[PDB]
Amino acid sequence: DLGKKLLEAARAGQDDEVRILMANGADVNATDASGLTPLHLAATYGHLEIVEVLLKHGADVNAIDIMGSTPLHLAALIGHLEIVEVLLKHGADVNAVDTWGDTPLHLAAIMGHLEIVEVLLKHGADVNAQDKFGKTAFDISIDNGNEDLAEILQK
Amino acid sequence: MRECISIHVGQAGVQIGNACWELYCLEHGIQPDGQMPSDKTIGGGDDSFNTFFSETGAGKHVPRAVFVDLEPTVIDEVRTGTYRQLFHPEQLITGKEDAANNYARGHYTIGKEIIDLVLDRIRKLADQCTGLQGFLVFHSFGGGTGSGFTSLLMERLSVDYGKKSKLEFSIYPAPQVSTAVVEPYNSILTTHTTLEHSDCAFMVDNEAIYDICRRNLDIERPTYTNLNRLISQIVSSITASLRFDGALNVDLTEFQTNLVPYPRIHFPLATYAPVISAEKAYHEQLSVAEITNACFEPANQMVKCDPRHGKYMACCLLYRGDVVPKDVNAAIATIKTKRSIQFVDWCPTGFKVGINYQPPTVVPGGDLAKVQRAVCMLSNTTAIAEAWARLDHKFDLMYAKRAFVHWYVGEGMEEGEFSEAREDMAALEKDYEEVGV
Amino acid sequence: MREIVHIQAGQCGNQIGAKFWEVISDEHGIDPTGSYHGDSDLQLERINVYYNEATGNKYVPRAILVDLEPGTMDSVRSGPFGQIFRPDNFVFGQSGAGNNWAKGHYTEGAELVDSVLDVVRKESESCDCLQGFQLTHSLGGGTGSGMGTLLISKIREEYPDRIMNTFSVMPSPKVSDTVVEPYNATLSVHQLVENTDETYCIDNEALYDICFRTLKLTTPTYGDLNHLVSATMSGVTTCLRFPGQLNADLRKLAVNMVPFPRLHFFMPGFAPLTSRGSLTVPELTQQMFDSKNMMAACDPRHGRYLTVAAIFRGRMSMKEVDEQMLNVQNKNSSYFVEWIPNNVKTAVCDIPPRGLKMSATFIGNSTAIQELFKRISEQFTAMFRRKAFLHWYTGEGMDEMEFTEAESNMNDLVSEYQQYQDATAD
Ligand SMILES: Nc1nc2c(ncn2[C@@H]2O[C@H](COP(=O)(O)OP(=O)(O)OP(=O)(O)O)[C@@H](O)[C@H]2O)c(=O)[nH]1
Ligand SMILES: Nc1nc2c(ncn2[C@@H]2O[C@H](COP(=O)(O)OP(=O)(O)O)[C@@H](O)[C@H]2O)c(=O)[nH]1
Numbered sequence A: 001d002l003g004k005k006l007l008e009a010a011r012a013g014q015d016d017e018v019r020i021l022m023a024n025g026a027d028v029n030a031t032d033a034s035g036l037t038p039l040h041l042a043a044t045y046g047h048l049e050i051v052e053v054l055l056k057h058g059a060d061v062n063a064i065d066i067m068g069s070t071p072l073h074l075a076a077l078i079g080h081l082e083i084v085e086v087l088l089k090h091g092a093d094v095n096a097v098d099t100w101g102d103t104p105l106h107l108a109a110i111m112g113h114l115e116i117v118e119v120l121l122k123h124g125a126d127v128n129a130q131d132k133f134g135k136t137a138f139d140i141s142i143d144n145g146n147e148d149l150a151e152i153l154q155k
Numbered sequence B: 001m002r003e004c005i006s007i008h009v010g011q012a013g014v015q016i017g018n019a020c021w022e023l024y025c026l027e028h029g030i031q032p033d034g035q036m037p038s039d040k041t042i043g044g045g046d047d048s049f050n051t052f053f054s055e056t057g058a059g060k061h062v063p064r065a066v067f068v069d070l071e072p073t074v075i076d077e078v079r080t081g082t083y084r085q086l087f088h089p090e091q092l093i094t095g096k097e098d099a100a101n102n103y104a105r106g107h108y109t110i111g112k113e114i115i116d117l118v119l120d121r122i123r124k125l126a127d128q129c130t131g132l133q134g135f136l137v138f139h140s141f142g143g144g145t146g147s148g149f150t151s152l153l154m155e156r157l158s159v160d161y162g163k164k165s166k167l168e169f170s171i172y173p174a175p176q177v178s179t180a181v182v183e184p185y186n187s188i189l190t191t192h193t194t195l196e197h198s199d200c201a202f203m204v205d206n207e208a209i210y211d212i213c214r215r216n217l218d219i220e221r222p223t224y225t226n227l228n229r230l231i232s233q234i235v236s237s238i239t240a241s242l243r244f245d246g247a248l249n250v251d252l253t254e255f256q257t258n259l260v261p262y263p264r265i266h267f268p269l270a271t272y273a274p275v276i277s278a279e280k281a282y283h284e285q286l287s288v289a290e291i292t293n294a295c296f297e298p299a300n301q302m303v304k305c306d307p308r309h310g311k312y313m314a315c316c317l318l319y320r321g322d323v324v325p326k327d328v329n330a331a332i333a334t335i336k337t338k339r340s341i342q343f344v345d346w347c348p349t350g351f352k353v354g355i356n357y358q359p360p361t362v363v364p365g366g367d368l369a370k371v372q373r374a375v376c377m378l379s380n381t382t383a384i385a386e387a388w389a390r391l392d393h394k395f396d397l398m399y400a401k402r403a404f405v406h407w408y409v410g411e412g413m414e415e416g417e418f419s420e421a422r423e424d425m426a427a428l429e430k431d432y433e434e435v436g437v
Numbered sequence C: 001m002r003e004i005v006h007i008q009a010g011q012c013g014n015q016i017g018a019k020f021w022e023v024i025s026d027e028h029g030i031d032p033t034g035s036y037h038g039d040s041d042l043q044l045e046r047i048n049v050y051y052n053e054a055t056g057n058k059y060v061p062r063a064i065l066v067d068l069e070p071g072t073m074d075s076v077r078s079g080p081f082g083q084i085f086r087p088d089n090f091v092f093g094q095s096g097a098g099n100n101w102a103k104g105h106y107t108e109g110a111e112l113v114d115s116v117l118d119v120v121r122k123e124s125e126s127c128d129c130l131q132g133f134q135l136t137h138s139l140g141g142g143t144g145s146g147m148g149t150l151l152i153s154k155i156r157e158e159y160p161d162r163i164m165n166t167f168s169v170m171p172s173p174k175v176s177d178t179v180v181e182p183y184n185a186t187l188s189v190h191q192l193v194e195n196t197d198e199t200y201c202i203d204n205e206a207l208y209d210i211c212f213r214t215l216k217l218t219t220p221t222y223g224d225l226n227h228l229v230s231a232t233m234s235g236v237t238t239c240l241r242f243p244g245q246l247n248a249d250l251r252k253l254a255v256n257m258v259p260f261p262r263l264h265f266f267m268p269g270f271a272p273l274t275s276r277g278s279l280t281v282p283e284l285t286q287q288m289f290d291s292k293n294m295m296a297a298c299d300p301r302h303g304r305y306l307t308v309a310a311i312f313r314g315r316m317s318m319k320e321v322d323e324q325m326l327n328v329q330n331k332n333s334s335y336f337v338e339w340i341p342n343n344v345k346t347a348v349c350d351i352p353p354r355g356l357k358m359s360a361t362f363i364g365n366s367t368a369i370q371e372l373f374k375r376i377s378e379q380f381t382a383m384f385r386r387k388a389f390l391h392w393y394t395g396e397g398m399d400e401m402e403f404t405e406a407e408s409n410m411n412d413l414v415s416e417y418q419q420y421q422d423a424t425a426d
């Protein structure tokens, strides 16, 4: 079963093995027990070259795991700026909502990724999107006392 | 002649003790090395000063005193001071680690490491006495050693010296010069466990002494040196009857008979007058009537309280200096109708009078001017319950949330001891109310 | 009592630890060689608290240096005051922690903990009457956080009656862009709540904000952030190192500042704020109670002070300090809990630090510190909900329940601060 080998290769950053497995019929949209695909793992562990190769071979840019997370959610949470830009260029839903009501904007705001917050806003991230507790990205910036984030969100 | 042993516990007791023994030496004419040229009997004697001083054989006059502290800093100043040759070196006892402002450390854990040595050293002084009458114990309410160690010591002295009297000179806390936030706790805990073992206790309110230094002595920011010099003057006036010839408060038993009508309400108020700055060296000398009137003014009291709010059970006036008995009696007559003095119905309305015709001594370097006549009034009034209420209120504010209680529990103490100590203070406030306040 | 044994663990621990010794040695008149060059006998009266007397009348710090990477050992030795440390007290490992708390607490760190405990015992037996321990470390890394907390628990086991004090650096995405730092800090806080008596919370978020907004530094460096850390550590340890009025010790500080056992995390502060090259008494009192002078990124006006200790340093009027402290207490009366009377203590020291003629150091136990813990808790939950990089910890033997237990304990600590923030005395 090459689907499990492609998931391991995408996580470990084995660029050459990703090429070999796809050439031998491996399922690019293979999922692990929690619904994560090779694109989710590549976006989480910061393998930009694997993200681009998977997107040129039919990866669903808006795939969701059992908790509603898209690859854009995970790249915005971990802080991989170049991956966030490649994903948005390939049609990622900037306003995708996971099982906690969080959007990628919420996660980049919580983790202090200010450059990713700016990129998301320039691609139409909804400043009024509330999480399950009713909080928008701006509410997070006021509650935590993050003046730099509050200034970026007031643009 | 019946001997008295003084015990000084913790920083406050040691520092006040050092100031008191310096003043006692100047009043009896004892040099810092222990020599007394006026003492004709070398090697011993039955004179009044021998109640506080023993004699060795080479004419040395040694205080009947023991200094104890759980850390050495403060006692080391007495070991290197001016009167370093005066005390017995084995009667200056120090541990290595203090009670960290915690009653439980002073009473249960740290204090237990040195209690047997302290009692064995006290025993050596006791064995040297022909007629020991009791002990004078100096200590703070707020410190961990002053509160916890003193309570442990007082419990042991009651077992080993059953029929002997025990008097206290206690420092009540003031926020202006306090050292710890838990001092109300330490004050209530030591009062509860010492109440049964003490016959009479003279509380000294640091706020009252601080205010006197500011108002009368013009000292902007009084330090412990200024406070202790004034406290030693008052302590000397109280103990003068035990160290000199006289007919009032001549032994420790008489302090109880004259000032303590019931065992638990054993906290008399001391008032002292006149307190004049040393820069006013050419001040007009105040008459007997003027200084006696000053004893009924709350500003001259050792404890902040209002005696107009209470009733008197006892009142002793102890004069020092140029005081004619008929002038005292005339002043007592005027301070019966002109002022509002109410005694309890079950006690005689009389005032006990004692006169020592030598004026008070001033210490070189002190803040007080020399005076031709001075007076110390000792009275048991129900108004002193105001001091207990202020302390109980501070205890209640913190204890309702159990703030800082874990520090006491972590040092071998049960939480129940806090409620039983507070219950005893509730009963004590009620005891004053039952008499009348 | 007197002696303190100091321990500095991990990258951050050793960097801020070395700066502490450089700053206090200059104040006490000790050169890198160890010889005394000061012109005042007040610099030597309480030297025994931090230094041991060596042969030839020379003073060697009672400091233990530890890390799982040898590179840190070389960086400390090559410093100005690097040769004064005892070479026997340098306990370094071969493989580092790699910003992983589990490597420091259970695998790499657990194998080197016995060797550090041997030099701790050696320093402790040479003490006349040891009062406690002070540890410098970060909570976002692997060695200072993971091995530092393991070393605290083992020292607590052999010395259960001695005080444990820490200078803990809290992480911020503004200084270090490593997303596993909320995991390492949350796991460390779970340990600190149980095993330390008093912790100074030095927050990198607050240090960066001070440098960038107040000192106008566009790109603050670690040296700039550590300039404020060294000034804070000098200020909070002043009374332990000089005579003054207070008979200074860590146990009396704990008994008076910690009303509840778990609420032992202090918010330090300093005034004036200055840079690595570039005041009246009422001006110092005002800055001490301002949110911009706090070393923890929390607004004191958002909570209530349970206890406060202030240390004024320099030549100044004693009555003026008493008067100005009283004025700030009345104007800000609603920010102090009314159920702990006389909860603000003032200390004075004549010897000021070098460069400044007068300074003030603030130590507050305030409920507003919950904002610092909520910031770390939110980042921990954002990462933990997606189980990101969890295998890096479970792979070293850690159980998944340890993350949930640390998370639950931190939320209970925030709940405990809110309980006493809303309490009333009547
Ligand atoms: N009048 C006066 N009060 C003092 C003096 N020294 C301390 N105090 C008061 O005593 C209380 C503190 O207790 P201390 O006597 O210093 O403490 P201790 O008995 O040594 O106990 P620990 O240090 O906790 O072991 C505070 O209320 C101080 O204001 C002094 O010399 N004179
Ligand atoms: N203020 C300050 N923070 C530091 C310093 N060195 C590292 N840090 C912080 O410490 C964290 C990383 O921990 P570090 O001490 O490098 O790791 P360790 O060697 O595993 O203990 C991050 O939050 C850094 O920002 C320093 O010298 N000063």
Ligand SMILES: COc1ccc(/N=N/c2cc(OC)c(OC)c(OC)c2)cc1O
Pocket (backbone or CB within 6 Å): B179, B180, B181, B182, C236, C237, C239, C240, C246, C247, C248, C249, C250, C252, C253, C256, C257, C307, C308, C309, C342, C343, C344, C345, C347, C363
């Ligand atoms: C809530 O009221 C209080 C608050 C703090 C108090 N003491 N504070 C200190 C501070 C110290 O240095 C930081 C000490 O040196 C390490 C220190 O050793 C004695 C005490 C005292 C209080 O009564």
Ligand SMILES: [Ca+2]
Pocket (backbone or CB within 6 Å): B039, B040, B041, B042, B043, B044, B045, B055
């Ligand atoms: Ca004789």
Ligand SMILES: [Mg+2]
Pocket (backbone or CB within 6 Å): B010, B011, B071, B098, B143, B145
């Ligand atoms: Mg003491």
